[PDB]
Enzyme design. Structure first.
Site, PDB file in Angstrom:
ATOM      1  N   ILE C  21      53.896 -65.310  -3.004  1.00  0.00           N
ATOM      2  CA  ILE C  21      54.328 -66.557  -3.654  1.00  0.00           C
ATOM      3  C   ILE C  21      53.982 -66.648  -5.145  1.00  0.00           C
ATOM      4  O   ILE C  21      54.504 -67.542  -5.815  1.00  0.00           O
ATOM      5  CB  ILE C  21      53.807 -67.816  -2.894  1.00  0.00           C
ATOM      6  CG1 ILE C  21      52.255 -67.826  -2.784  1.00  0.00           C
ATOM      7  CG2 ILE C  21      54.473 -67.923  -1.514  1.00  0.00           C
ATOM      8  CD1 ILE C  21      51.638 -69.181  -2.468  1.00  0.00           C
ATOM      9  N   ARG C  23      51.959 -64.446  -8.894  1.00  0.00           N
ATOM     10  CA  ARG C  23      51.227 -63.371  -9.552  1.00  0.00           C
ATOM     11  C   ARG C  23      50.801 -63.809 -10.948  1.00  0.00           C
ATOM     12  O   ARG C  23      51.636 -63.907 -11.845  1.00  0.00           O
ATOM     13  CB  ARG C  23      52.064 -62.077  -9.631  1.00  0.00           C
ATOM     14  CG  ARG C  23      51.321 -60.912 -10.297  1.00  0.00           C
ATOM     15  CD  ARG C  23      52.042 -59.581 -10.172  1.00  0.00           C
ATOM     16  NE  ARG C  23      51.195 -58.465 -10.603  1.00  0.00           N
ATOM     17  CZ  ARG C  23      51.617 -57.225 -10.853  1.00  0.00           C
ATOM     18  NH1 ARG C  23      52.906 -56.916 -10.739  1.00  0.00           N
ATOM     19  NH2 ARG C  23      50.757 -56.291 -11.240  1.00  0.00           N
ATOM     20  N   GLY C  24      49.509 -64.058 -11.123  1.00  0.00           N
ATOM     21  CA  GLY C  24      48.949 -64.398 -12.423  1.00  0.00           C
ATOM     22  C   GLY C  24      48.745 -63.161 -13.281  1.00  0.00           C
ATOM     23  O   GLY C  24      49.028 -62.038 -12.847  1.00  0.00           O
ATOM     24  N   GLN C  25      48.243 -63.345 -14.509  1.00  0.00           N
ATOM     25  CA  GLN C  25      47.992 -62.220 -15.409  1.00  0.00           C
ATOM     26  C   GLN C  25      46.937 -61.270 -14.820  1.00  0.00           C
ATOM     27  O   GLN C  25      47.101 -60.055 -14.912  1.00  0.00           O
ATOM     28  CB  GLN C  25      47.568 -62.723 -16.801  1.00  0.00           C
ATOM     29  CG  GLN C  25      47.285 -61.607 -17.808  1.00  0.00           C
ATOM     30  CD  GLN C  25      47.332 -62.058 -19.250  1.00  0.00           C
ATOM     31  OE1 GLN C  25      48.005 -61.442 -20.083  1.00  0.00           O
ATOM     32  NE2 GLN C  25      46.606 -63.117 -19.603  1.00  0.00           N
ATOM     33  N   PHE C  26      45.888 -61.819 -14.176  1.00  0.00           N
ATOM     34  CA  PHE C  26      44.821 -61.021 -13.567  1.00  0.00           C
ATOM     35  C   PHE C  26      44.704 -61.279 -12.051  1.00  0.00           C
ATOM     36  O   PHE C  26      43.620 -61.082 -11.509  1.00  0.00           O
ATOM     37  CB  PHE C  26      43.462 -61.346 -14.235  1.00  0.00           C
ATOM     38  CG  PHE C  26      43.478 -61.521 -15.736  1.00  0.00           C
ATOM     39  CD1 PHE C  26      43.592 -60.429 -16.575  1.00  0.00           C
ATOM     40  CD2 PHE C  26      43.325 -62.773 -16.306  1.00  0.00           C
ATOM     41  CE1 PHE C  26      43.591 -60.590 -17.955  1.00  0.00           C
ATOM     42  CE2 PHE C  26      43.324 -62.931 -17.684  1.00  0.00           C
ATOM     43  CZ  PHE C  26      43.456 -61.839 -18.501  1.00  0.00           C
ATOM     44  N   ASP C 142      40.737 -72.933 -17.692  1.00  0.00           N
ATOM     45  CA  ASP C 142      42.181 -72.703 -17.812  1.00  0.00           C
ATOM     46  C   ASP C 142      42.948 -73.877 -17.209  1.00  0.00           C
ATOM     47  O   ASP C 142      43.684 -73.718 -16.235  1.00  0.00           O
ATOM     48  CB  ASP C 142      42.590 -71.362 -17.161  1.00  0.00           C
ATOM     49  CG  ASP C 142      43.972 -70.849 -17.534  1.00  0.00           C
ATOM     50  OD1 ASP C 142      44.621 -71.464 -18.407  1.00  0.00           O
ATOM     51  OD2 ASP C 142      44.397 -69.825 -16.960  1.00  0.00           O
TER      52      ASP C 142
END
Ligand SMILES: O=C1CCN(c2cnc3cc(CNC(=O)[C@@H]4Cc5ccccc5CN4S(=O)(=O)Cc4ccccc4)ccn23)C(=O)N1
Ligand SMILES: Nc1ncnc2c1ncn2[C@@H]1O[C@H](COP(=O)(O)OP(=O)(O)O)[C@@H](O)[C@H]1O
Ligand SMILES: [Mg+2]
Ligand SMILES: [Zn+2]
Lengths: 804, 366, 281
Positions: C21, C23-26, C142
């Site tokens: 569902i 995908r973040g940067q890390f 964040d």
């Protein structure tokens, strides 16, 4: 390690069974009585009873019947103990030496068995050919009375009926027969079985009638010429002989259950029937004329003779004199004045024999301030209730009949009076209220009152606090408690900064809807200027089972809590600290700052009051599940108790332990089968104040008063080796080992005794003859250790007798 | 089924990863996938069918001191997928004391254990029953009074006659009724019929040892109290403790929060023939002892309702968790049709609940 | 299929991934179903052994242990965490209904600003979430519209929690934005550590994006040199007066201040949001 010495101060006085026959000689009519562990032999004379010999048997006499084998000049006695020790004894006297020999002996306990609900039943065939013992359900044991049967070899015949109520060998039978009343889900029924020694099978008997009374509990074998059996329930008396089945329901017997019987005439014409309320009835069997049929019962009649003690057993002797073996009150020889016109027959008690059992509660007092202690007990139950003052001077005993159940007792030295909680049974009257059955201590008091606090035929138990004078023993006051209020505990002590001594009573509000007591109260009373005054009242959410004065403060047990109250200057019970535990705190005993708490299932613990904390600290626990009756603190480390089948045990605090687990666990360091049910323990002594330290007296159901005292290891090991030497020299009655009798016993297990010395066996060292004394003291060491002489150990045993 | 002898030491295999406290008489459904666990069960079918289930006091650590033997009464093998799935239903028989734990090379544990005896004590009045009253001690069994009875009338007459000899002892008749096997069983039956409305004595046992262990399984109690009831050896003490739990611990809070009340005793009712608490199984072999309650508090619904694998047919289940710590407590079941009574109910797993005393300040006694 | 009941939520064996569902940067988020009870969870896998050093891994694991202990309704609760197959697995409360970024994008498509009554309704819930985190001395690092989740019933839940703090930017670049929050604060320009005042700047900048449907520095995102200079000078177009109240706009200007000390604490932002929400509702 704890080491104790138990010696009997007063032998068990309650009578559990009595029998008549010709034990000493065919020409002597005897009355043999069983007072739990003792057996008394008497000769019936116009002067009442002549004492012949009392013997100390190592066992609870469960069965006691007389029988005469064909050829024997005089009767033999069969005794079966609670531990199933069967034996046949013969009376033998050479000049003056009276000794009871053991003809046959043995232990008839089966390897696996289901003990019956109606107890142990022992019956003998009229022709002295076998002994039928119904010990377990479904197994009828038969012991043939053969010439060479010294070890009583027995065999069980498989009985289909398990819930058997009562069995008796019928008379008028060519082949032996056993009649019995048994219960099954369909109802109670009567059935007969012919006993076959050869085939070992229960052959079809002459008859079997079904649908008998719902409460049919007793069976009586009727002798020739009548034959057959008499079955008695609660509301009717029946007779069965196959073709004949009579049944009478007189209204004079319906008010109470008939529980004991005895044959008056050897032919079976007259019978005595005692009930639970102590009334005595005469059951007559009218015989009709003979063509050739002398086996014809015409009619049955019942006539209330009069009121006697609450009879456990009855025994007709001669000249209308009947011995009444009472277990709740004094046993007594009563005269039946039937010799008038047969219409108005009345009883006249002629001789009462002291019975202290059941000893429910007691206290050590010194009324005359002479140093020698006096024990006042709450003996008896129902109309047999009484207070017995035992003093040493061989023990002199004064009785104060109360005619109601005494429950608790305490002494108040400042007001010269005793506090006694008691209960009477009043029936639910026709008007809606309640009426007393008979006059009693509470109803005939000089002054009486009812508590003013406000927080059909059914029997109602009414509790009252009696303030009885110490010299005259007159009931000075009788304070009755509230409706549905059960008085459980009572103490007399000074609390806080108050100089007056108060009688404190702990109660429980018992309602039939409430299963556990959710409410109760502690009432504080002051007796001054001849009258009792309600001073303070503290309602609690539970039953107050036990109370004790703890360093000038009132410690009380409420359901599962041990609370401490401090008496304020405003005369109110203010709470200081509580201890909520996993046990229903029933027993409470204290010594300094230590508290012993106990359960009815031997779940015990030890707490300690720490003034720095202002709360209780749990020191040790010991949860071995087994029934209990009473506990006592011997010292800071040793604690005594009584459990399930008449045992005594000692639990000790492991002080030398390193871990918390071992320090918080009390080690079972003592076990002993006493043979008596202990209800109360009390620190004190009857003798004015040695190898002993401490003096803990105890009261039992059978009316026996004992004494336990601590000994050093050197005295314990000396008396343990001396006990074994005495045991291997003394001729035990019924060839029963002393080690087996005193070994701890329950339906689960039978383990050897430890940490206890049987003082009765130690005192018997002075009764044995001098050649037998030399046999005992041979090779025994006494302290430098030297060979013990008879004279030195006589002085040691004499010092042990000086404590009681 | 023949049962082991008392105090006899048995070497029996402990099934791996079965982190639960089995009670004698309790059913244990299990789903095995590993050929090592399946072959062990296959060899146990050729022998007495008895294995061991340890009562681990600590979840993270292997602090296991007590346990219960489990006899396999039903075997079932499936070959639907490449894995031979074997589902078996076992029944607890006897408690035991752990003497030694031997982990074998194949991962299966072998436990040398001592079979604990059942402490069967006689009646309290047996020590003081008079010989004259032994004959009239047995109560008359009759359909006119023992059935269709007032209960208030019969139990009064039962206490008077059985504990008549209490006058000889230092305690009242009613105190002996508190340590009486039949009276305690009757008191538990009263409280148990309130929840399991359609219950009768034909299902509950007559013996007090078998009755107490049956009651421990039915009661919604956490692993702490479940160990404590098995530690108690005497059935009188076990029934007294169970009945004290029923009277005092009437509030059922979240186990993680401890102070978040989810439901109470009065809300317990039955919708299954087993009773209010029943051991259901999910599509992956996990067993949940779910308690059937009328209303529940402090629970939020996560996700949408579903009908697949619904344990109560005709009821859409929805995942329920604690509103405070979000821990899974159960599932809310809503009726699909309008006439289906009850309208709504909650199935709460036992592992997530904690029986607490109502909000006020007591210990549970035996 | 392996099943390890004893582990519970601390192993992959007891979960079946339904679908990916996010995908973040890390990070990698997946909609997974717990095989033990059917609780829908969001399995967030982070490759900590690939780029985070031993010290940055330990600081993150230690913080995750205290984040499990957090207890607030408007915060995505960390159910369990475990290291398996050299991958940090974090089990989260699934909030797949939507987010503040999706709502703002939908209102942009319809060409209508979000009503102020609806703005305070969701801002007051997030202010309670940050107030509880700051009371336990926990920094989000964040705060952005994507991390402000909204359920179908309208319940706000702040989650994910900024991983960017490990920051390195090993390339020889003039300016860097990798490993920095959505709303970079002026102190973060010097490549220094994080502070509670950076979360106030991000919360203030978020309230701006709720009102104007765009980040305070939207447009400058293309040319990073102007963006870095405008953040230091706080040169952003102020919110229009004809659409929102004076109290909403002055709170934005107070939170968006260069000096960290001059920014008000979350205590006063949550107090003002509660006063405005009570009046509008
Ligand atoms: O009435 C009750 C009370 C609740 N309950 C119950 C108790 N413990 C569980 C566990 C699960 C786990 N299983 C799941 O969450 C999911 C979704 C789902 C949804 C509803 C029904 C079954 C399934 C099957 N899967 S799946 O992963 O296999 C299928 C799948 C495969 C690949 C991709 C996507 C999905 C469910 C119910 N559980 C009952 O059993 N009955
Ligand atoms: N707890 C969560 N529940 C549901 N979806 C989530 C969750 N956390 C993140 N996501 C989804 O993952 C994506 C963003 O991944 P995330 O790892 O949060 O990265 P970032 O914080 O850098 O945006 C979005 O599609 C978001 O909806
Ligand atoms: Mg994030
Ligand atoms: Zn919770």
């Amino acid at each position: 390690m704890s080491y104790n010495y138990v010696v009997t101060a007063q032998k068990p006085t309650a009578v559990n069974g009595c029998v008549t026959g010709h034990f000493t000689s065919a020409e002597d009519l005897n009355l043999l009585i069983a007072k739990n562990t003792r057996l008394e032999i008497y000769v019936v004379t116009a002067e009442g009873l002549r004492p012949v010999k009392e013997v100390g048997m190592y066992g609870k006499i469960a069965v006691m019947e007389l029988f005469r084998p064909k050829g024997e000049s005089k009767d033999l006695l069969f005794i079966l103990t609670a531990k199933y020790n069967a034996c046949i004894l013969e009376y033998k006297q050479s000049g003056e030496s009276i000794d009871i020999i053991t003809r046959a002996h043995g232990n008839v306990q089966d390897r696996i068995g289901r003990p019956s609900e109606t107890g142990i039943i022992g019956i003998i065939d009229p022709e002295c050919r076998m002994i039928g013992l119904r010990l377990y359900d479904g197994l009828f044991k038969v012991i043939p009375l053969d010439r060479d049967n010294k070890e009583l070899k027995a065999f069980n015949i498989r009985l289909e009926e398990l819930h058997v109520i009562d069995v008796k060998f019928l008379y008028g039978c060519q082949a032996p027969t056993i009649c019995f009343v048994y219960q099954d889900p369909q109802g109670r029924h009567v059935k007969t079985y012919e006993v076959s020694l050869r085939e070992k099978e229960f052959n079809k008997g002459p008859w079997k009638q079904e649908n008998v009374e719902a409460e049919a509990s007793m069976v009586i074998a009727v002798p020739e010429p009548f034959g057959g059996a008499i079955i008695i329930g609660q509301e009717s008396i029946t007779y069965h002989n196959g073709d004949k089945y009579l049944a009478i329901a007189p209204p004079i017997i319906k008010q109470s259950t008939i529980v004991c019987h005895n044959r008056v005439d050897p032919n079976g014409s007259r019978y005595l029937l005692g009930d639970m309320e102590g009334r005595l009835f005469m059951l007559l069997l009218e015989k009709e004329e003979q063509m050739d049929g002398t086996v014809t019962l015409k009619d049955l009649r019942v006539e209330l003779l009069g009121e006697t003690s609450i009879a456990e057993c009855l025994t007709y002797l001669d000249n209308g004199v009947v011995f009444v073996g009472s277990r709740l009150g004094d046993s007594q020889l009563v005269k039946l004045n039937v010799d008038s016109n047969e219409q108005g027959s009345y009883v006249v008690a002629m001789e009462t024999f002291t019975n202290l059992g059941p000893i429910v509660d007691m206290c050590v007092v010194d009324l005359e301030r002479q140093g020698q202690g006096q024990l006042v007990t709450c003996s008896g139950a129902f109309k047999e209730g009484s207070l017995r003052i035992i003093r040493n001077g061989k023990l002199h005993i004064r009785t104060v009949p109360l005619y109601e159940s005494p429950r608790k007792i305490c002494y108040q030295e400042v007001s010269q009076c005793f506090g006694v909680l008691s209960s009477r049974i009043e029936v639910q009257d026709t008007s809606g209220g309640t009426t007393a059955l008979r006059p009693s201590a509470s109803t005939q008091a000089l002054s009486s009152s009812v508590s003013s606090s406000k927080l059909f035929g059914e029997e109602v138990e009414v509790h009252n606090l009696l303030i009885i004078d110490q010299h005259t023993f007159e009931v000075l006051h009788a304070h009755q408690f509230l409706q549905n209020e059960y008085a459980l505990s009572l103490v007399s002590c000074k609390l806080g900064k108050d100089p007056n001594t108060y009688f404190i009573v702990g109660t429980a509000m018992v309602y039939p809807e409430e299963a556990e007591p959710k409410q109760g109260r502690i009432v504080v009373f002051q007796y001054s200027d001849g009258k009792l005054q309600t001073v303070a009242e503290k309602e609690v959410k539970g039953a107050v089972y036990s109370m004790v004065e703890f360093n000038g403060k009132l410690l009380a047990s409420i359901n599962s809590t041990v609370r401490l109250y401090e008496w304020t200057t405003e005369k109110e019970l203010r709470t200081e600290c509580n201890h909520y535990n996993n046990i229903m705190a029933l027993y409470l005993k204290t010594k300094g700052d230590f508290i012993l708490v106990g359960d009815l299932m031997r779940s015990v613990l030890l707490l300690a009051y720490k003034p720095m904390e202002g709360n209780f600290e749990e020191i040790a626990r010991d949860f071995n599940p087994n029934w209990m009756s009473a506990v006592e603190i011997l010292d800071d480390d040793n604690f005594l108790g009584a459990e399930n089948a008449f045992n005594l045990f000692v639990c000790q605090k492991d002080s030398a332990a390193t871990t918390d687990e071992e320090r918080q666990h009390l080690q079972e360091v003592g076990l002993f089968h006493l043979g008596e049910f202990v209800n109360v323990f009390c620190h004190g002594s009857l003798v004015m104040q040695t190898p002993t330290q401490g003096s803990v007296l105890f009261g039992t159901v059978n009316g026996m008063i004992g004494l336990v005292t601590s000994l050093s290891e050197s005295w314990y090991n000396l008396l343990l080796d001396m006990q074994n030497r005495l045991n291997k020299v003394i001729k035990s009655v019924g060839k029963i080992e002393h080690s087996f009798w005193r070994s701890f016993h329950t339906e689960r297990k039978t383990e050897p005794a430890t940490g206890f010395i049987d003082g009765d066996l130690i005192e018997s060292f002075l009764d044995i003859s001098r050649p037998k004394m030399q046999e005992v003291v041979a090779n025994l060491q006494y302290d430098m250790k030297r060979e013990a002489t008879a004279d030195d150990l006589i002085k040691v045993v004499e010092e042990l007798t000086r404590i009681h | 089924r023949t049962l082991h002898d008392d105090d006899s030491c048995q070497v029996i295999p402990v099934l791996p990863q079965v982190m639960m406290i089995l009670i004698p008489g309790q059913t244990l459904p299990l789903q095995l996938f590993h050929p090592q666990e399946v072959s062990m069960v296959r060899n146990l079918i050729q022998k007495d069918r008895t294995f061991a289930v340890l009562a681990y006091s600590n979840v993270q650590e292997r602090e296991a001191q007590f346990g219960t033997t489990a006899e396999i009464y039903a075997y079932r093998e499936e070959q639907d997928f490449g894995i031979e799935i074997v589902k078996v239903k076992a029944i607890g028989r006897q408690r035991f004391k752990v003497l030694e734990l031997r982990t074998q090379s194949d991962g299966i544990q072998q436990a040398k254990v001592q079979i604990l005896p059942e402490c069967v004590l006689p009646s309290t009045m047996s020590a003081v029953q008079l010989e004259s009253l032994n004959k009239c001690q047995i109560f008359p069994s009759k359909p006119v009074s023992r059935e269709d009875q007032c209960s208030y009338k019969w139990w009064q007459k039962y206490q008077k006659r059985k504990f008549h000899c209490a006058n000889l002892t230092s305690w009242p008749r009613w105190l002996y009724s508190l340590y009486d096997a039949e009276t305690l069983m009757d008191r538990i039956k009263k409280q148990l019929r309130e929840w399991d409305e359609n219950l009768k004595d034909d299902s509950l046992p007559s013996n007090p040892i078998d009755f107490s262990y049956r009651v421990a399984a039915c009661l919604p109690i956490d692993d702490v109290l479940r160990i404590q009831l098995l530690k108690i050896g005497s059935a009188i003490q076990r029934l007294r403790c169970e009945l004290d739990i029923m009277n005092k611990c009437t509030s059922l809070c979240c186990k993680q929060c401890q102070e978040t009340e989810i439901t109470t005793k009065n809300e317990i009712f039955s919708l299954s023939l087993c009773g209010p608490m029943a051991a259901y199984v999910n599509p992956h072999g996990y067993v949940h002892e779910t308690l059937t309650v009328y209303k529940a508090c402090n629970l939020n619904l996560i996700g949408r309702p579903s009908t697949e694998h619904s344990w109560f047919p005709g009821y859409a289940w929805t995942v329920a968790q604690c509103k405070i710590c979000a821990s899974h407590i159960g599932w809310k079941f809503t009726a699909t049709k309008k006439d289906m009574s009850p309208q709504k109910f909650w199935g709460l797993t036992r592992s997530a609940l904690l029986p607490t005393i109502p909000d006020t300040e007591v210990i549970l006694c035996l | 299929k392996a099943l390890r009941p004893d582990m519970g939520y601390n192993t992959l064996a007891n979960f079946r991934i339904e679908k990916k569902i996010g995908r973040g940067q890390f990070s990698e988020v997946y909609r997974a179903a717990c095989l033990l009870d059917g609780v829908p969870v969001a399995l967030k896998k982070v490759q900590i052994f690939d780029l985070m050093d031993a010290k940055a891994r330990a600081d993150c694991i230690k913080e995750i242990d205290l984040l499990k202990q957090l207890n607030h309704p408007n915060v995505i609760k960390y159910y369990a965490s475990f290291i398996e197959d050299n991958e940090l697995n974090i089990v989260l409360e699934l909030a797949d209904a939507g987010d503040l970024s999706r709502m703002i994008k939908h209102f942009k498509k319809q060409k209508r600003l979000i009503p102020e009554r609806t703005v305070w309704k969701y801002f007051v819930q997030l202010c309670s979430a940050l107030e509880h985190m700051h009371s336990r001395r926990v920094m989000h690092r964040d705060i952005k519209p994507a991390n402000v989740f909204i359920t179908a019933t309208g319940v706000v839940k702040l989650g994910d929690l900024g991983l960017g703090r490990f920051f390195s930017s090993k390339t020889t670049a003039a300016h860097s934005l990798v490993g920095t929050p959505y709303y970079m604060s002026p102190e973060r320009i010097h490549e220094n550590g994080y502070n509670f005042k950076s979360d106030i700047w991000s919360l203030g900048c978020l309230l701006y994006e709720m009102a104007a449907l765009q980040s305070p520095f939207y447009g400058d995102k293309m040319n990073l040199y102007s963006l870095c200079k405008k953040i230091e000078q706080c040169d952003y177009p102020p919110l229009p007066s004809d659409h929102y109240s004076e109290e909403l706009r002055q709170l934005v200007n107070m939170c968006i201040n260069p000096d960290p000390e001059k920014r008000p604490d979350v205590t006063y932002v949550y107090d003002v949001a509660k006063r405005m929400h009570a009046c509008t509702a």
